[PDB]
Amino acid sequence: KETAAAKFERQHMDSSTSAASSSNYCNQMMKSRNLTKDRCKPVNTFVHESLADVQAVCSQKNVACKNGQTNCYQSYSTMSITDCRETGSSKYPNCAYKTTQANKHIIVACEGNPYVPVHFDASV
């Protein structure tokens, strides 16, 4: 079974680019991060910062998570992110995503020792 921290890395980290450079970014990344294997994951955000910078959020601003848990943290800085969401043309096995690039604060839930991100809650 994949660890929670490793699942977060796979689903949400893309430190190899500064930003989505095209409309096809999400189609490509959703496929390659194995988020379309058996069904199309409906919504998923990638963060274009170093892993260290995203881990560091777990010692930044403590805020409520949407679900009411208290282990969420909001980045002090905005970060380069890309939201990927299925479009109306999407139909497994031919998933199709809209790519929306933005610079926003991220909110992550953190757990463990080391205390690291395990869920992507939202951007602001």
Annotated binding-site members: 7, 10, 41-45, 66, 85
Binding residues for substrate: 7, 10, 41-45, 66, 85
Closer residue to Cl ion (CB): 33 or 55: 33
Q: Strand 79-86 to strand 116-123: parallel, antiparallel, or no bridges (unpaired)?
A: unpaired
119 is catalytic: yes
DSSP-assigned letter for residue 116: E
Strands (E), the chain: 43-47, 61-63, 72-74, 79-86, 97-104, 106-111, 116-123
> Is position 97 an interface residue for Cl ion (rule: CB under 5 A)?
no
Closer residue to Cl ion (CB): 25 or 120: 120
In the complex, minimum distance from the CB of residue 32 to Cl ion, in angstroms, rounded to a whole number:
16
Neighbours of 112 (CB within 10 A): 12
Residues annotated as part of the active site: 12, 119
